[PDB]
C-alpha cells in the first residue's frame, strides 16, 4: 500500500530558492492550477502548510474543495490558538462539503516568536499538554458525544458538534514531531506519524521508537515521510537542476537561515538542520538524498535527486521500513507535479503504475 | 445609496416553521444555488449566520467565493474563541481570494450555554472587554503594524499579518448590539451598526444614540437593519403566506403597519418581517431609509425561491442600481 | 424502470404565457441555475430544445457539462443542415467530456419557413430520406468504421470519427414524430420513441403502431412522453395556478399564434392543435390533462394539473402503457423543478422515492 | 497594439515529436489546465485547431468559456459542412455566454480526403466560392438582416438570427490562405489575415499583396502570424531542446532564429522561433514592424511552455504584456 501526496505552495513559489528572481506569486488562480493538476494526475492528496508565512490553510482548502473531484486535503490544525469545539465544527463542515476528503495535520508550533504573535506563551511541554487536551476534546465531539472536560489548559462544558463528519470515527489524524512529548502524543492519539527526509537509518530508529510506544498503548500507527524531489530523465540533468535551484543564494544568506532555525524550539527542525552545517559543499548526505533545500527553507530540508530508477529505489527503501505515505514537492510546483507523475508513477505500486497512460 | 443583502441558510431551510415537513437540508449544492442566485440577481451580498446550529461560516464562505463574481460575504468572527492574529490572517486570505468581497460581522455570543461549550467562561461585561481588545489588535495587524498588546484579556507580542488585504484599511466591520457597551464599541471601532426589525420609532432612537456617541469620537457610522420579507403581488396573498408559514405552531402578531413578528416564534433568522404587496414593502423600506439606514439584510422561506421573488417584485421600486437590474 | 427529465428553457422563461410580464431572460447564470438544480435534485437529465427561437443547443449543453456531476443532456441534432460526420464528432467530443452523459434527440424540422432559413428546401418525405441517410452514417462512424455511403441526398467517402464515444454503441437516440415516415424511421433506427402529452388512449395506439413496426425490423424500442406539469399541495391550488398561467391571453393572439401552427409541416403539431382549436373554454381534455399551454406555445401543449396523488396517478397510467421516460417542465422552470421534485418524487418508483 | 495568443492542443500533446514517449492525451482536465493557464497569465486568447484529428472545437470552446474570465477563444468555422444560418446562431450564443470573448477563424480545408469524408466534393476554386457565399450570409444575419441569398452553392430564404451577438458588427473574422482566391477573399470580407511563420522577406510580400487588394475595395485589414516557440534562458538550452524534440524521426535553420524542425510532422505551425528572450523578442519586433499585430504562439508541452513564454518574453513585449509579470 502506498499513498503519494503533493504540496500546495501557500507560502510562495518560483524557480529558485532564496532569490526573488523567477518568483511566482500565490493567487487563487495559481492554487487552482496546482490543485487541479494533482487531482487530474492522480495524487492521493496535497499537504497545505500553516504558519505566519502562509495564507490561511482552512480558507485555501475550502476554496479548492468544490473545484476538485478525488483529491484529498491534508489541512493543519494548531491547538492553543483556537477553541477545540470550533475547530471540530470546521473539520466537520469541510469534511461534509468534500464528501470525506479531509485529512488533519496536528501542528504544535515550533517558533516561539510566532506563537507569541498568536497570543500563546507556552513552554515546549505546555504546548504538548495543550495539544493532548485539544485532541481529546476534538476526537470525542466529532463522534457525537456532548463532551465535559476540565484539564490543566482547556475547559469545556457540554461541547457538541451537531453535524457529524463523513469519515469515521473522525478525519484521520496526521502528526509530525521528534521530541519525547511528540512520540508519546503520536503513539496515543494520532493515526499517521510523519517524519522529514532523514537518511534511511535515522528514520528507521524513529519509526521503531514510535512503534514500540504505540504497542504499550495497544495501538498501531502508520507512517509517512516528507521529501522534496528533483527527478529528470537522466542523472546528469537532475544534479544540474539541484545545483541551479540554489545558485542565487549568497553565503551570507545561508548563515542567516542557519541561525534563524536555532530560535525554533523544535526538535524536528533541530535534526533536519543538523544534517547540513551550512556548507555549500558535500550536500549529498546519502545515496540520492541531497540536503541543499534546507539551506534556506524552513520545514523540509532534503530532496531525492536522480533518475527515475534511482528515485523509485529510495522510495522502496523507505517503504520497506514500513512507510506508506509520501509527501513530495518541487520547484516550481505546477511543472514538477507533472514531472514526477510522468517519470516516477509507472515505477511505483498500484494504482500509481496504471495512472500514467 | 442602498445595499440590499440576502441570507444564506447555513442552519437549514424549509417551507414552514416548527415542522420538519418540507425541510431542505443544508448541502454544498443547495448553498451554491442560493449564493449563485443572489450573485446573478444583483444582491450586494449575503449574510452568513454563525453558531452551534450552523455549519462553519468560514468554510462555507471560502467554498462559495470562487463560484461567484460580485456577491459579497458578511462572515462572522467571534472574539474569545480564536486568536485575533489568526482571525486576521483568515480575513486577509478570504479578502484576497475574493478580490475584496469580504465583510466582517462582529459577534460576541449571546448564549452562555453555547459559549461554555466553546471554552469561554466570561460574563456579559467581560465579553465586550474581550471584543474591544480583539478588534484593536485585529484592525492594527491588518494595517501592516507589528502589534505589541497586553490588555486585561488578550496579550500578543510581534503580531503580524504578512499578506495585506484588498479592502483598505481592512474589511468593513458590521456589528449589532443594544447594550451601552455595544453602542460605545460601535461608536469607536465599527463601520456599520446593525439593528433588528423594530418599529420605526424604536429604530430612530437607537440610531440617534449611536450617532451621538460616534460624533464624540469624530467619526460617522452607517446603519443597517435585518428583516424577513414576505412579499407577493397583492396584499391578500402576502398575509395568507404568513399564516401558512406558521400553521404547524402551538399556542395579534402585527406590531406595526406591515411589520409582522411571526417569524420570531422560533429561533430562526430574525424576529420581524415585512408583509405586504410591492408598494407596501418598498414604502416601509423607504421609511427606514429616511432614518439613516443604508444596509438591508433580507431573508425568506425558502431562501432560493424568495430571493427571486423579492428581486423581481421590489427591486424595480428601490433606488439604483436595483432599478436597472430587473431588465 | 423510469427516467424523469426536466427542461432547460432556452426559449426564454417567465411566470405567464403570452405577455412579457414576469419574464425571465435566458442567461448563462440562469441556465446554470436550472441545470444545477436538476442535477442536485436527482433528475435523470434535461431536454434542450432547438430552433430559430432558441439559443444553440450544442453551445449550451457543452457549457453546462463541466458544471454538473450526474445530470444527462438530451441534445438535438438536425439532419439536412449539418454534415453527419461533423455531427458525429461533436457527439463524441461532448460524450467524452461528460463521461457518458450525452443523449441525442433527432429533430427533422417541422417549420418549412425556418428550414428555408437554414438553406434546406425539402418536402416532408425528403426530410425523412435525408434523416434516414444521416442516421445510417452517424451510427456507423461512431462505431469505428471508415464509412463509404452514396445515397439520394448524402454522400461520404472515408468518413471517420477518430475519437470513440463513451456510451456504446453510441449516445442513445431519442426521436419524436407522428407521421408515417416518422414511425418507420423510429422503428428502424432510434432507441426511444417520444410523444407529446395526448390522452392515454391516443398514446397507446401510437405506441402500438411503433411497437408493431419495430418487430418487423427485429427490434424493440422504449417509449417516452413530454408533458408540462402544474402540481400544488391541493387540487384547488393547482387549477388556480393553471388559470393564472393563461390569464393575459387575448383572443387575437390565440389566432395569431395558433394559425402559425397551421403553416407547420408537422403531424405532431397538427394533432396537438387539434385538442383545443383556439377555444379557451373546456381545456381539460382528460382527467387532470389540461391543454391550455398549447394556446400560444408550440411543441408540448398539455400539462398534468392536480395534487401530488392525482399527478402521480396519471404518470402511473402512462407507465402501464410502456412509457419509461418522462420529460417534464414548468413555469417558471427553476421554482417548478423543486416543486415537482419535492411533491411528486416521493410518490414515484425508486430511485426518486428515496432521493429526499 | 499587439495580441499574443496561445494554443489549445486539441489534437494531442507531449514532450517529443514522432514518438509516443512522453505523450499527454487530450482530456477535459488537461484542456482546462492549458486554458486556465493562458487566462491567468494574461494571454489575449487561444487558437483552437479544427479537423479530423481534433476533438470538436465548438464543444471544447463552449465547455471552457464558463471556467475562464478574460481569455478569448479563436474557434474555427468550416463552410461547406454546416449551414451558415446555423453557424451564426452558434457564434451568437457562444459570444453572448462569453460576454464578447469569441473570435472566428474561417477555415476552407486543404485536405481533400478529409473533405470527402465530411460530404464535400468541391475543387479548390469551388471551396472559396462557397466560403465567399458563406461569409456574406453569415455576416449579414449576425447584423440583424433578414437575408435572401441565391448563389452558385448556397441558397437561403428569410434567414434570421434572433439573438444578436455582443461584439459589433460581429465577432472578428480571422483568415489564412496563400492562393489568389484566398487573398481576394481576405481583402473583401475578413478582419485579420493570418500567415505562417515564413522569414520576414516572405511575410512582407504576402502582407503587401493582401493590403494592396484591400485598398481597392476601400477596406483595411490587420495581420497576424502563427509561430511555434522554443525559448529558454540561454540560446544553448533552446537549441538543445530543439534537438531533443525531433530526435526520434527518420540543416534546418532557414533564417536567423527561424527553425523549421517542427514542420517535419503536422501539428500546428511549421517553423519556430528558437533562442533566448532577447533573440525571440527581437524577431517579434521584426515581424511587428511589418504590420503584424496578432501573434499565435505554441510550445511542447503546451502547459509548461505557456508559463515559460509568459515569464521570459512578456516583460520584453509592449504593454499590457510588460506589466503583467508583476
Ligand atoms: C511533515 C511535517 C509537516 C509539518 N508541517 C508544519 C506546518 O505546516 N507548520 C508548522 O508550524 N509546523 C509544521 N511541522 C512541524 C511540527 O508540526 C511541529 O510544529 C514542530 O516539529 C515542533 O515539534 P517537535 O519539537 O516535537 O519537533 C511539520 C512537521 C512535519 C514532519
Ligand atoms: C443584525 C444582527 C446580526 C447578528 N448575527 C448574529 C449571528 O450570526 N450569530 C450570533 O450568535 N449572534 C448574532 N447576533 C447577536 C450578537 O451576538 C449580539 O452581540 C447579541 O445580541 C448580544 O448583544 P447585546 O447583549 O448588546 O444585545 C446578531 C445581532 C444582530 C443585531
Ligand atoms: C419530445 C419532442 C421534442 C421535440 N423537439 C423539437 C425541437 O427541439 N425542435 C423542433 O423543431 N422540433 C421538435 N420536435 C418536433 C419533431 O422533431 C418534428 O420537428 C415534427 O414533429 C415534424 O415531424 P412529423 O410531421 O412527422 O410529426 C419535437 C418533438 C417531440 C415529440
Ligand atoms: C494561421 C493559420 C491557421 C490555420 N488553421 C487551420 C485549421 O485549423 N484547419 C485547417 O484545416 N486549416 C487551417 N489553415 C489552412 C487554411 O485554412 C487553408 O485551408 C490553407 O491555407 C489552404 O488554402 P490555400 O490554397 O489558400 O493555401 C490555417 C492556416 C493558417 C495560416
Find the CB nearest A85 among B60, B96, B119: B119
> D40 in contact with A at a CB cutoff of 8 Å?
yes
| Torsion sign, CA atoms A296, A297, A301, A304 | negative
Closest chain B CA to residue A117: B159
**What CA–CA distances, in Å, run from C176 to C121, C135, C271?**
21, 14, 13
- Can you say how many angstroms the Cα of residue B185 is from the centroid of all Cα atoms in its chain? 17
Find the CB nearest D82 among C83, C121, C154: C83
> A40 in contact with B at a CB cutoff of 8 Å?
no
Residue whose C-alpha cell is 435525408? C130
Q: Which residues pair with D8 in a beta bridge?
A: none
Residue whose C-alpha cell is 550536500? A283
- Can you say how many angstroms the Cα of residue D229 is from the centroid of all Cα atoms in its chain? 15
> D266 C-alpha vs ligand 4 centroid, how far in Å?
12
Q: How far apart are alpha carbons A227 and A323 in whole angstroms? A: 12
Residue A155 CB partners (closer than 8 Å, separation 6+): A149, B119, B121
Q: Which of C6, C116, C176, C179 to mutate to test the pocket of ligand 3 (most atoms within 8 A of CB)?
A: C176
Q: Does the Cβ of D107 fall within 6 Å of ligand 4?
A: yes
Other CB atoms within a 10 A radius of the CB of residue D41 amount to 21
Q: How far apart are alpha carbons C191 and C222 in whole angstroms? A: 6
| Residues belonging to chain A | 357
Which residue numbers of D belong to the known binding site? 11, 50, 78, 105, 109, 124, 128, 176, 178-179, 196, 226, 266, 269
| Partner-chain contact C338 B304, CB within 8 Å | yes
C-alpha cell at C216: 418487423
The residues spanned by each domain of chain B are 3-317
**Is B3-317 a domain of CATH 3.20.20.30?**
yes
A152 by Cβ neighbours in 10 Å (0-12 / 13-18 / 19+) ranks as exposed
> C269 C-alpha vs ligand 3 centroid, how far in Å?
8
Q: Parallel, antiparallel, or unpaired: how do β-strands B147-150 and B155-159 relate? A: antiparallel
Residue B120 CB partners (closer than 8 Å, separation 6+): A83, B80, B81, B109, B127
Run of H or E residues at D196:
none
Q: How far apart are alpha carbons A261 and A278 in whole angstroms? A: 12
Please choose, from the candidates C137, C132, C148, the residue with its C-alpha nearest in 3D space to the C-alpha of residue C188: C132
D1 by Cβ neighbours in 10 Å (0-12 / 13-18 / 19+) ranks as exposed
> B16 in contact with C at a CB cutoff of 8 Å?
no
| Partner-chain contact C66 D28, CB within 8 Å | yes
Please choose, from the candidates B27, A245, A281, the residue with its C-alpha nearest in 3D space to the C-alpha of residue C37: B27
Residues 248-287 of A with CB under 8 A from D: none
| Partner-chain contact B27 C40, CB within 8 Å | yes
Residue whose C-alpha cell is 470513440? C164
Other CB atoms within a 10 A radius of the CB of residue D265 amount to 11
Q: Does the Cβ of B110 fall within 6 Å of ligand 2?
A: yes
**What CA–CA distances, in Å, run from C320 to A237, C231, C315, C327, D10?**
70, 21, 9, 17, 47
**What CA–CA distances, in Å, run from D179 to A262, B186, D127, D131?**
73, 75, 12, 14
Measured in angstroms, the CA of D91 and the nearest CA of chain C are apart by: 9
C-alpha cell at A206: 524513529
Q: How far apart are alpha carbons C187 and C206 in whole angstroms? A: 12
CB of D51 within 8 A of CB of D11? yes
C-alpha cell at C282: 373546456
The CATH architecture assigned to C3-347 reads: Alpha-Beta Barrel (3.20)
CB of C273 within 8 A of CB of C261? yes
* CA torsion angle B187 B192 B197 B200 (round to 10): 60
C78 marked as part of a ligand binding site: yes
Residue A40 CB partners (closer than 8 Å, separation 6+): D27, D29, D30, D33
Please choose, from the candidates C225, C223, C197, C205, the residue with its C-alpha nearest in 3D space to the C-alpha of residue C304: C197
Q: How far apart are alpha carbons A288 and A344 in whole angstroms? A: 15
Q: How far apart are alpha carbons D143 and C137 in whole angstroms? A: 35
Q: Which residues pair with B103 in a beta bridge?
A: B74
B9 DSSP assignment: -
Closest chain B CA to residue C69: B29
Phi, psi of C62 (to 5 degrees): -65, -35
Phi, psi of B60 (to 5 degrees): -65, -50
Q: Parallel, antiparallel, or unpaired: how do β-strands C289-290 and C173-176 relate? A: unpaired
D76, HSE (Cβ side, Cα atoms, 13 Å): 23
| Partner-chain contact B93 A56, CB within 8 Å | yes
Q: How far apart are alpha carbons B60 and A90 in whole angstroms? A: 10
D150 by Cβ neighbours in 10 Å (0-12 / 13-18 / 19+) ranks as exposed
> A33 in contact with D at a CB cutoff of 8 Å?
yes
C-alpha cell at A250: 549568497
C140 marked as part of a ligand binding site: no
Which residue numbers of A belong to the known binding site for succinate? 11, 196, 226, 297, 300
> B308 in contact with C at a CB cutoff of 8 Å?
yes
- Ligand number nearest to the C-alpha of D81: 4
Please choose, from the candidates B171, B174, B140, the residue with its C-alpha nearest in 3D space to the C-alpha of residue B65: B171
Q: How far apart are alpha carbons B46 and B76 in whole angstroms? A: 12
Nearest atom of ligand 2 to the alpha carbon of B177: 26
Elucidation method:
X-ray
Phi, psi of D224 (to 5 degrees): -140, 160
User: Could you check whether the bond before residue D320 is cis, i.e. omega within 30 degrees of 0?
Assistant: yes
Please choose, from the candidates D133, D136, D138, the residue with its C-alpha nearest in 3D space to the C-alpha of residue D152: D133
How far does chain C reach from its first CA to its final CA, in angstroms? 19
Q: How far apart are alpha carbons B58 and B95 in whole angstroms? A: 12
Helix, strand and coil in chain D, % to nearest 5 = 40, 20, 40
Other CB atoms within a 10 A radius of the CB of residue B273 amount to 28
Nearest residue by C-alpha to atom 11 in ligand 3:
C109
H helices present in A112-260, as ranges:
112-117, 124-141, 180-189, 200-216, 235-245, 251-260
CB of B118 within 8 A of CB of A134? no
CB of D13 within 8 A of CB of D302? yes
| Partner-chain contact A90 B156, CB within 8 Å | no
> C112 C-alpha vs ligand 1 centroid, how far in Å?
73
Q: How far apart are alpha carbons A338 and A332 in whole angstroms? A: 11
> B136 in contact with A at a CB cutoff of 8 Å?
no
Residues of C in contact with B312 (CB under 8 A): 22, 24
CB of C329 within 8 A of CB of C318? no
Find the CB nearest D33 among A22, A37, A342: A37
Residue whose C-alpha cell is 431519442? C174
Amino acid at each position: 500500500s502506498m499513498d503519494v501526496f503533493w504540496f500546495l505552495p501557500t507560502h510562495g513559489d518560483g524557480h529558485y530558492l532564496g532569490t526573488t528572481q523567477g518568483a511566482r506569486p500565490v493567487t487563487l488562480n495559481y492554487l487552482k492550477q496546482v490543485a487541479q493538476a494533482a487531482d487530474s494526475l492522480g495524487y492521493h492528496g496535497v499537504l497545505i502548510p500553516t504558519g505566519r508565512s502562509c495564507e490561511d490553510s482552512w480558507v485555501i482548502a475550502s476554496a479548492l474543495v468544490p473545484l476538485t473531484e478525488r483529491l484529498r486535503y491534508l489541512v493543519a490544525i494548531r491547538p492553543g490558538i483556537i477553541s477545540p469545539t470550533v475547530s471540530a465544527r470546521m473539520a466537520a463542515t469541510l469534511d461534509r462539503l468534500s464528501n470525506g476528503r479531509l485529512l488533519i495535520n496536528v501542528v504544535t508550533g515550533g517558533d516561539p516568536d510566532e506563537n507569541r504573535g498568536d497570543g500563546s506563551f507556552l513552554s515546549h511541554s505546555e504546548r504538548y499538554e495543550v495539544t493532548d487536551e485539544f485532541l481529546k476534546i476534538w476526537r470525542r465531539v466529532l463522534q457525537g458525544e456532548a463532551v465535559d472536560f476540565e484539564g490543566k489548559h482547556l475547559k469545556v462544558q457540554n461541547a457538541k458538534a451537531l453535524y457529524p463528519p463523513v469519515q469515521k470515527p473522525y478525519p484521520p489524524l496526521y502528526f509530525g514531531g521528534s521530541s519525547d512529548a511528540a512520540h508519546d502524543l503520536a503513539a496515543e492519539q494520532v493515526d499517521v506519524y510523519l517524519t522529514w527526509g532523514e537518511p534511511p537509518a535515522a528514520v528507521a530508529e524513529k519509526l521503531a521508537d514510535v512503534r514500540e510506544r504505540a504497542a504499550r498503548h495497544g495501538r498501531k500507527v502508520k507512517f509517512g515521510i516528507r521529501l522534496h524531489v528533483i527527478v529528470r530523465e537522466t542523472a546528469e540533468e537532475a544534479w544540474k537542476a539541484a545545483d541551479k535551484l540554489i545558485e542565487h543564494i549568497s553565503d551570507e544568506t545561508i548563515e542567516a537561515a542557519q541561525k534563524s532555525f536555532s530560535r525554533f524550539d523544535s526538535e524536528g527542525q533541530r535534526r533536519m538542520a543538523a544534517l547540513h552545517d551550512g556548507r555549500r559543499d558535500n550536500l549529498e548526505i546519502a545515496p540520492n538524498l541531497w540536503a541543499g533545500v534546507g539551506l534556506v527553507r524552513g520545514g523540509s530540508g532534503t530532496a531525492l535527486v536522480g533518475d527515475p530508477q534511482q528515485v523509485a529505489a529510495r522510495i522502496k527503501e523507505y517503504a520497506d521500513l514500513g512507510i506508506e505515505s509520501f509527501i513530495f514537492s518541487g520547484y516550481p510546483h505546477l511543472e514538477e507535479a507533472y514531472r514526477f507523475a510522468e517519470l516516477v508513477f509507472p515505477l511505483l505500486p498500484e494504482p500509481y503504475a496504471s495512472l500514467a497512460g
